[PDB]
Symmetry: C3
């Protein structure tokens, strides 16, 4: 009767010890996660793809400008002769 | 006396099982967090706003260049004529 | 015999209450970590250094364009008189 209670107490202690270990483990796993305060969210940042597309847009305008410059240099050389 | 111990044992078993469930749940919530090792910190990356401001600066120079080009094309058409 | 069981019961109650508190704490610490769903990984985004290098490349083409534009403006002024 009393020994049956002792066996159940031992059982409980074991389950508690397991729980304490799961908690110690969880605390360490938490330490490996990035804090909201030190990381930008998706709404605050562009992806590589998005940046790539914006850079192409600029490169295009620059190509347009260079081709206009080259055409103007040719016109000037014709006027000169 | 012994029944009072049994009641308390039942109470403890219930709590333990609730605790175990809270822990299983916590483990799942941890798995949805990003690791420090796989995410850039705020000092490593620019925000959308910062990129937008850098792109604007460039777009504004490009506009200035295009307006100079349009002016030059006009001068050249006058010289020719 | 019965008092030895009571002592062990007291010990278990104490630990459980501590555990419940550690869990409440842990839940709050978890809320401060960034979710995988709201953060980009390192391979999805460019760093400041990488963006800086792409912006330099563009600035160099712009410098080249400006000097050509300045030279062309001078030629045009000479042709005019």
């Amino acid at each position: 009767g009393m020994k049956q209670i002792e066996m159940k107490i031992e059982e409980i202690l074991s389950k508690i010890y397991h729980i304490e270990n799961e908690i110690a483990r969880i605390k360490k796993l938490i330490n490996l996660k990035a804090n909201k305060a030190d990381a930008y969210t998706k709404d605050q940042a562009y992806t590589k793809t998005e940046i790539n597309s914006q850079m192409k847009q600029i490169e295009w305008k620059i190509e347009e400008i260079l081709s206009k410059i080259y055409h103007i240099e040719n016109e000037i050389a014709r006027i000169k002769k």
